[PDB]
Scaffold this motif. Structure first.
Motif, PDB file in Angstrom:
ATOM      1  N   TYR A 100       0.820  -1.212   0.000  1.00  8.08           N
ATOM      2  CA  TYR A 100       0.000   0.000   0.000  1.00  8.08           C
ATOM      3  C   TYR A 100       0.854   1.264   0.000  1.00  8.08           C
ATOM      4  CZ  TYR A 100      -4.141   2.873   1.000  1.00  8.08           C
ATOM      5  OH  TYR A 100      -5.156   3.799   0.937  1.00  8.08           O
ATOM      6  N   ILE A 101       1.945   1.271   0.776  1.00  2.00           N
ATOM      7  CA  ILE A 101       2.849   2.426   0.799  1.00  2.00           C
ATOM      8  C   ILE A 101       3.542   2.594  -0.555  1.00  2.00           C
ATOM      9  CG2 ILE A 101       5.020   3.244   1.866  1.00  2.00           C
ATOM     10  CD1 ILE A 101       3.896   2.056   4.510  1.00  2.00           C
ATOM     11  N   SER A 102       3.903   1.467  -1.190  1.00  2.77           N
ATOM     12  CA  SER A 102       4.472   1.502  -2.537  1.00  2.77           C
ATOM     13  C   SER A 102       3.477   2.041  -3.563  1.00  2.77           C
ATOM     14  CB  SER A 102       4.941   0.105  -2.939  1.00  2.77           C
ATOM     15  OG  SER A 102       5.828  -0.433  -1.975  1.00  2.77           O
ATOM     16  N   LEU A 103       2.185   1.730  -3.393  1.00  2.98           N
ATOM     17  CA  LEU A 103       1.157   2.332  -4.243  1.00  2.98           C
ATOM     18  C   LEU A 103       1.032   3.833  -3.997  1.00  2.98           C
ATOM     19  CD1 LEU A 103      -1.214   2.241  -6.260  1.00  2.98           C
ATOM     20  CD2 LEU A 103      -2.684   1.500  -4.371  1.00  2.98           C
ATOM     21  N   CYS A 104       1.099   4.252  -2.724  1.00  7.72           N
ATOM     22  CA  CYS A 104       0.960   5.666  -2.362  1.00  7.72           C
ATOM     23  C   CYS A 104       2.070   6.528  -2.942  1.00  7.72           C
ATOM     24  CB  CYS A 104       0.945   5.829  -0.843  1.00  7.72           C
ATOM     25  SG  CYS A 104      -0.608   5.414  -0.046  1.00  7.72           S
ATOM     26  N   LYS A 105       3.277   5.971  -3.081  1.00  5.36           N
ATOM     27  CA  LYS A 105       4.395   6.752  -3.612  1.00  5.36           C
ATOM     28  C   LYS A 105       4.266   7.121  -5.094  1.00  5.36           C
ATOM     29  CE  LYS A 105       8.385   6.204  -0.642  1.00  5.36           C
ATOM     30  NZ  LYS A 105       9.857   5.990  -0.666  1.00  5.36           N
ATOM     31  N   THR A 106       3.340   6.517  -5.847  1.00  5.44           N
ATOM     32  CA  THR A 106       3.213   6.823  -7.269  1.00  5.44           C
ATOM     33  C   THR A 106       2.469   8.127  -7.548  1.00  5.44           C
ATOM     34  OG1 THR A 106       1.189   5.505  -7.456  1.00  5.44           O
ATOM     35  CG2 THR A 106       3.285   4.388  -7.864  1.00  5.44           C
ATOM     36  N   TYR A 107       1.714   8.650  -6.588  1.00  6.70           N
ATOM     37  CA  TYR A 107       0.891   9.830  -6.812  1.00  6.70           C
ATOM     38  C   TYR A 107       1.690  11.107  -6.579  1.00  6.70           C
ATOM     39  CZ  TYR A 107      -3.351   6.999  -7.089  1.00  6.70           C
ATOM     40  OH  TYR A 107      -4.315   6.095  -7.469  1.00  6.70           O
ATOM     41  N   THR A 108       1.289  12.171  -7.283  1.00  8.36           N
ATOM     42  CA  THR A 108       1.855  13.514  -7.106  1.00  8.36           C
ATOM     43  C   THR A 108       0.720  14.532  -7.040  1.00  8.36           C
ATOM     44  OG1 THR A 108       2.125  13.774  -9.499  1.00  8.36           O
ATOM     45  CG2 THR A 108       4.064  12.988  -8.274  1.00  8.36           C
ATOM     46  N   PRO A 109       0.043  14.646  -5.891  1.00  3.23           N
ATOM     47  CA  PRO A 109      -1.090  15.577  -5.789  1.00  3.23           C
ATOM     48  C   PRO A 109      -0.654  17.036  -5.812  1.00  3.23           C
ATOM     49  CG  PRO A 109      -0.604  14.637  -3.663  1.00  3.23           C
ATOM     50  CD  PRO A 109       0.245  13.907  -4.637  1.00  3.23           C
ATOM     51  N   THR A 110      -1.429  17.847  -6.524  1.00  2.00           N
ATOM     52  CA  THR A 110      -1.146  19.265  -6.679  1.00  2.00           C
ATOM     53  C   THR A 110      -1.900  20.079  -5.636  1.00  2.00           C
ATOM     54  OG1 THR A 110      -2.917  19.480  -8.313  1.00  2.00           O
ATOM     55  CG2 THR A 110      -0.699  19.023  -9.134  1.00  2.00           C
ATOM     56  N   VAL A 111      -1.305  21.201  -5.245  1.00  2.00           N
ATOM     57  CA  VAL A 111      -1.886  22.070  -4.227  1.00  2.00           C
ATOM     58  C   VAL A 111      -2.933  22.972  -4.869  1.00  2.00           C
ATOM     59  CG1 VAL A 111      -1.346  23.685  -2.353  1.00  2.00           C
ATOM     60  CG2 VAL A 111       0.337  21.976  -3.057  1.00  2.00           C
ATOM     61  N   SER A 159      -5.601  10.546  -3.465  1.00  2.00           N
ATOM     62  CA  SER A 159      -6.234  11.591  -4.244  1.00  2.00           C
ATOM     63  C   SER A 159      -5.173  12.378  -5.004  1.00  2.00           C
ATOM     64  CB  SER A 159      -7.049  12.515  -3.339  1.00  2.00           C
ATOM     65  OG  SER A 159      -6.212  13.173  -2.404  1.00  2.00           O
ATOM     66  N   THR A 160      -5.631  13.205  -5.940  1.00  2.00           N
ATOM     67  CA  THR A 160      -4.737  13.951  -6.811  1.00  2.00           C
ATOM     68  C   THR A 160      -4.794  15.456  -6.591  1.00  2.00           C
ATOM     69  OG1 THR A 160      -6.444  13.836  -8.529  1.00  2.00           O
ATOM     70  CG2 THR A 160      -4.693  12.181  -8.591  1.00  2.00           C
ATOM     71  N   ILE A 161      -5.648  15.943  -5.689  1.00  2.00           N
ATOM     72  CA  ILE A 161      -5.741  17.364  -5.353  1.00  2.00           C
ATOM     73  C   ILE A 161      -5.768  17.483  -3.829  1.00  2.00           C
ATOM     74  CG2 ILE A 161      -7.156  19.485  -5.556  1.00  2.00           C
ATOM     75  CD1 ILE A 161      -8.138  18.504  -8.249  1.00  2.00           C
ATOM     76  N   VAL A 162      -4.963  18.407  -3.288  1.00  2.00           N
ATOM     77  CA  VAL A 162      -4.876  18.618  -1.845  1.00  2.00           C
ATOM     78  C   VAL A 162      -6.155  19.273  -1.333  1.00  2.00           C
ATOM     79  CG1 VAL A 162      -3.479  19.755  -0.024  1.00  2.00           C
ATOM     80  CG2 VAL A 162      -2.379  18.774  -2.030  1.00  2.00           C
ATOM     81  N   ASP A 163      -6.639  18.800  -0.184  1.00  2.00           N
ATOM     82  CA  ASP A 163      -7.812  19.346   0.477  1.00  2.00           C
ATOM     83  C   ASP A 163      -7.436  20.146   1.722  1.00  2.00           C
ATOM     84  OD1 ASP A 163     -10.273  18.441  -0.995  1.00  2.00           O
ATOM     85  OD2 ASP A 163      -9.382  16.477  -0.642  1.00  2.00           O
ATOM     86  N   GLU A 164      -8.347  21.059   2.089  1.00  2.00           N
ATOM     87  CA  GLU A 164      -8.207  21.833   3.320  1.00  2.00           C
ATOM     88  C   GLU A 164      -8.269  20.944   4.558  1.00  2.00           C
ATOM     89  OE1 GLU A 164     -11.138  24.937   3.871  1.00  2.00           O
ATOM     90  OE2 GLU A 164      -9.669  26.248   4.843  1.00  2.00           O
ATOM     91  N   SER A 165      -8.930  19.785   4.459  1.00  2.00           N
ATOM     92  CA  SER A 165      -8.879  18.783   5.521  1.00  2.00           C
ATOM     93  C   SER A 165      -7.457  18.269   5.743  1.00  2.00           C
ATOM     94  CB  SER A 165      -9.817  17.625   5.184  1.00  2.00           C
ATOM     95  OG  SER A 165      -9.450  17.013   3.959  1.00  2.00           O
ATOM     96  N   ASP A 166      -6.711  18.037   4.657  1.00  2.00           N
ATOM     97  CA  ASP A 166      -5.314  17.621   4.777  1.00  2.00           C
ATOM     98  C   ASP A 166      -4.443  18.735   5.348  1.00  2.00           C
ATOM     99  OD1 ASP A 166      -5.835  15.070   3.800  1.00  2.00           O
ATOM    100  OD2 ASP A 166      -5.481  15.662   1.717  1.00  2.00           O
TER     101      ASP A 166
END
Ligand SMILES: Nc1ncnc2c1ncn2[C@@H]1O[C@H](COP(=O)(O)OP(=O)(O)NP(=O)(O)O)[C@@H](O)[C@H]1O
Ligand SMILES: [Mg+2]
Ligand SMILES: [Zn+2]
Ligand SMILES: [Zn+2]
Lengths: 632, 227
Positions: A546-557, A606-613
């Motif tokens: 799961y951590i290896s899957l998480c490293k593939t994303y690059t969410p934008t601010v 996700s691919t977009i940063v949220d205010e919750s994050d």
DNA sequence: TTTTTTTTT
């Protein structure tokens, strides 16, 4: 008392390739995967077959056990028979068609066979290494063939052997001669010489009968358009720690790697190897000739346990709980380690680079499981190194100059932060390192490079690593009468390089002590965590997946988060002015906020940063700040 | 009619030379965007290149005027002209380079009716890879790589033709060195003695050679590799 | 021989 009827053995081998099968997953039919791979070689989509001997052993074929034992006992001979049967299968598939020309040797062979035209002649004129252009490798999984480096002795020469170990040294790929081709000056004939071992002697005088009888004295000139080369690589492999006897130091062995098995390893990897043990051409030196290599660091496919999580979502609390479930509590600390395992994005605006990864410093009183948490993180991360403050020099952390006594040469040798590149370095007992050893990491923690100018060497090395550190406070215990800067005895330039700083206390309390005692005694009873609430927890393997899957994303601010982030930074910087017990705050803080927000977006997939994050990053920073003033 | 072929490839020499002569005499396409180090020539001091002419025909004027002895051949221009020739140049540099030279010298002699002290030599450039990505298939092919220069050696003399002298009667013979090898004469044609000649080293002919050490750039590399 | 580096006393 020997068997040399090769045709019967070829018949047995071809029957194996014809009759091994696996049922289709929908039940629609049967796959015959070995002959599918043979046809891939025939149409030149492939270069090697890897055969599993245990499949031969457990096949539903007569004399299968005898064939497997013969392969294992004289593996260096049975490779030739496997190549011959695959060549016959390729010709039976191909028929009167021609295989495609892809390289200069293929062009030379296809042109020259029809120049010869314009099977006895073919087999007499050309050696089989030149007629056959693919590779065959064997593997085993049964524990009868598992051995250490220490156990490979005189009974194992010529046999197939399997082992497991660590790679110390590895060379770069080199061209190795397999068949030389020479041409005569006067009579225009050709000589083919196959090469075995690490030496060969070139012939001088032309052997062709007309040239010899005429005494034309034609020299032989070697040609590299007809000659055959192969990828070659050399390794040294060390014993694993569990394999060593009591009170003893591990041993090493040299390994030779050919063809498609090259470039599968680099220094600092743990491997499973199958190969053949051989001498060098009355006391003899030996090596291992590798047949198959597997990285255990590495090994679109997804497991079903991961598919359930990926469909579920909301996984953040379960992921936090699944880090070292033997350790009770410390939920926010486990969340901080979970964010450090993922990290943010690298930024390279207008030529100026910014670090993407997160740094964490842990402190606490003795006996609060810092070393246990660091050990679990070292097992969980793909590429990671572990060091202590006393056992490491400032040259063993960064890189060293080595003076070879045999040649007199100087060379560079990469240390722990170089070997951990792209991963995590854990540093235990961080307060007990010397100052002149500790100051080496200043360049690594912010610029992610090591630069050297010594003797006759001047280079730069890449070190893109996160650092997780553990220490005790300045006199072994937190003192509530002394300031934060007195309790944490580090300079401000080093303190500003850590994104998070935490404190873990041990304080006596009559209910919490009993609850902790119940948890620890249950672990000692049963060998596993209690799970009294019967909630789900994730295995270590699928957590790594799961951590290896998480490293593939690059969410934008999102640009809407600007005012919240900047106002939080200004409000944080007010207190360090107007406090009685302040801490140091610098412009690196706001970059830390952005890093933690993008890290939780990666955890959410996700691919977009949220205010919750953004809010969760601010909550964790507030917790880290409040940890350093307990009971105030 | 006897005809010459590259060994084992069915490439004939002259048919390449025809197309390369067409390329030299005809190509003018890229000259709107001439590069920084290529846009000036000279007869004396410095002068600027004109766009509208065939480009390498314009560059040959520098070889006539300033007596420059080499041409920098941008391979992107050749690839734009014909990929079928670009592939041959990259695949067989050790065989075709000795004839594209001769086409350049032929065109120079025809254009200017003149001789020079040394032959005009080709330098192809701007074909990129990494030092670790090389394979045994790439042997004798054309490549380009980049790095920093750390050290250079002193010069080495490399012989091209030796000079023998008979010990008995002072007769003297030249002998070309080729394929890395020289051939020694056995019988003196003047005085008819055998096993008689001695090499005179300082009467023979040499060329310059230098060794340069090059280092990897650290930027491109994957995880954990040292340069 | 003399020179330069990293661990040990
Ligand atoms: N909350 C806890 N849950 C489970 N085991 C614990 C807990 N706290 C301490 N332990 C145990 O305490 C022992 C010591 O752990 P350790 O990781 O060495 O502590 P430490 O923080 O490293 N102390 P120190 O290294 O001297 O600063 C281990 O056997 C742990 O299992
Ligand atoms: Mg500890
Ligand atoms: Zn001959
Ligand atoms: Zn003579």
């Amino acid at each position: 008392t020997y068997n040399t009827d090769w045709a019967a053995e070829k018949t047995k081998i071809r029957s194996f390739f014809d009759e091994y099968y696996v049922d289709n997953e929908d039940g629609s039919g049967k796959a015959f995967p070995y002959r599918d791979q043979v046809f891939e070689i025939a149409r030149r989509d492939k270069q090697a077959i890897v055969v599993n001997v245990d499949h031969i052993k457990e096949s539903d074929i007569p004399d299968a056990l005898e064939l497997s034992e013969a392969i294992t006992s004289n593996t260096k001979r049975y490779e030739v028979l496997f190549k011959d049967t695959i060549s016959d299968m390729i010709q039976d598939y191909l028929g009167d068609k021609q295989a495609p020309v892809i390289d200069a040797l293929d062009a030379y062979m296809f042109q020259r066979l029809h120049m010869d035209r314009n099977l006895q002649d073919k087999r007499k004129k050309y050696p089989p290494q030149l007629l056959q252009r693919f590779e065959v490798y064997f593997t085993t999984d049964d524990a009868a063939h598992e051995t250490c480096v220490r156990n490979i002795k005189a009974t194992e020469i010529g046999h197939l052997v399997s082992m497991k170990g660590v790679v110390i040294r590895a060379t770069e790929v080199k061209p190795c001669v397999e068949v030389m081709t020479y041409t005569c000056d006067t009579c225009a004939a050709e000589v083919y010489q196959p090469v075995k071992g690490m030496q060969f002697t070139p012939p001088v005088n032309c052997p062709n009968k007309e040239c010899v009888e005429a005494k034309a004295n034609g020299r032989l000139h070697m040609q590299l358009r007809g000659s055959k080369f192969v990828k070659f690589q050399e390794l040294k492999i060390q014993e694993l720690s569990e394999q060593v006897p009591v009170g003893s130091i591990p041993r090493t062995m040299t390994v030779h790697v050919y063809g498609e098995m090259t470039r599968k390893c680099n220094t600092g990897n743990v491997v499973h190897v199958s190969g053949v043990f051989l001498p060098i051409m009355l006391v003899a030196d030996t090596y291992l000739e590798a047949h198959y290599i597997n990285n255990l660091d590495d090994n679109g496919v997804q497991s079903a346990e991961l598919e359930v999580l990926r469909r579920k979502g909301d996984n953040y609390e379960t992921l936090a709980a699944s880090i070292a479930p033997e350790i009770f509590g410390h939920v926010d600390v486990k969340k901080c380690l979970l964010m450090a395992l993922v990290g943010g994005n690298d930024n390279s605006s207008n030529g100026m680079k910014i670090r993407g990864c997160i740094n964490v410093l842990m402190m606490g009183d003795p006996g609060v499981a810092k070393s246990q948490l660091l050990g679990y993180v070292n097992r969980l991360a793909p590429r990671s190194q572990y060091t202590t403050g006393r056992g490491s020099s400032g040259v063993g952390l960064t890189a060293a100059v080595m003076k070879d006594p045999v040649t007199g040469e100087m060379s560079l040798e990469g240390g722990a932060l170089v070997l951990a590149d792209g991963g995590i370095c854990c540093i235990d007992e961080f307060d007990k390192m010397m100052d002149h050893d500790r100051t080496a990491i200043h360049e690594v923690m912010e610029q992610q490079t090591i630069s050297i100018a010594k003797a006759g060497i001047m280079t730069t090395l890449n070190a893109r690593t996160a650092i997780i550190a553990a220490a005790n406070p300045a006199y072994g215990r937190y003192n509530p009468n002394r300031s934060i800067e007195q309790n944490v005895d580090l300079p401000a330039a080093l303190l500003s390089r850590f994104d998070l700083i935490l404190l873990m206390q041990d304080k006596a309390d009559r209910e919490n002590d009993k609850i902790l005692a119940e948890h620890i005694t249950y672990v000692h009873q049963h060998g596993c965590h209690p799970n009294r609430e019967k909630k789900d927890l994730i295995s270590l393997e699928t957590l790594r997946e799961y951590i290896s899957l998480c490293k593939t994303y690059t969410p934008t601010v999102d640009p809407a988060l600007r005012e919240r982030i900047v106002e939080a930074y200004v409000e944080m910087r007010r207190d360090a002015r107007y406090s009685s017990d302040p801490t140091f705050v610098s412009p690196r803080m706001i970059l830390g906020i952005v890093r933690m927000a993008t890290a939780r977006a990666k955890l959410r997939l996700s691919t977009i940063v949220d205010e919750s994050d953004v809010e969760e990053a601010l909550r964790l920073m507030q917790f880290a700040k409040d940890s350093l003033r307990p009971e105030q | 009619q006897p005809r010459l072929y590259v060994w084992g490839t069915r490439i004939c020499v002259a048919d390449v030379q025809r197309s390369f002569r067409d390329f030299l005499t005809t190509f003018k396409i890229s000259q709107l965007a001439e590069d920084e180090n290529m846009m000036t020539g000279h007869d004396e001091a410095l002068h600027e290149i004109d766009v509208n002419h065939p480009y390498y025909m314009e560059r040959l004027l520098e070889c006539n005027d300033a007596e420059v002895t080499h041409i920098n051949l941008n391979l992107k221009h050749l690839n734009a002209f014909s990929e079928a020739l670009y592939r041959k140049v990259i695949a067989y540099p050790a065989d075709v380079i000795p004839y594209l030279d001769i086409v350049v010298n032929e065109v120079f002699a025809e254009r200017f009716n003149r001789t020079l002290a040394q032959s005009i030599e080709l330098r192809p450039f701007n074909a990129t890879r990494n030092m670790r990505g090389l394979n045994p298939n790439d042997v004798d092919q054309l490549i380009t790589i980049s790095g920093m220069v750390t050290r250079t050696s002193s010069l080495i003399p490399e012989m091209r033709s030796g000079y023998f002298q008979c010990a008995v009667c002072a007769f003297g013979i030249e002998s070309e060195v080729d394929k890395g090898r020289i051939e020694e004469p056995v019988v003196c044609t003047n005085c008819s003695n055998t096993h008689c000649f001695q090499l005179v080293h300082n009467r023979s002919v040499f060329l310059d050679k230098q060794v340069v050490k090059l280092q990897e750039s650290p930027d491109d590399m994957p995880s954990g590799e040292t340069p």
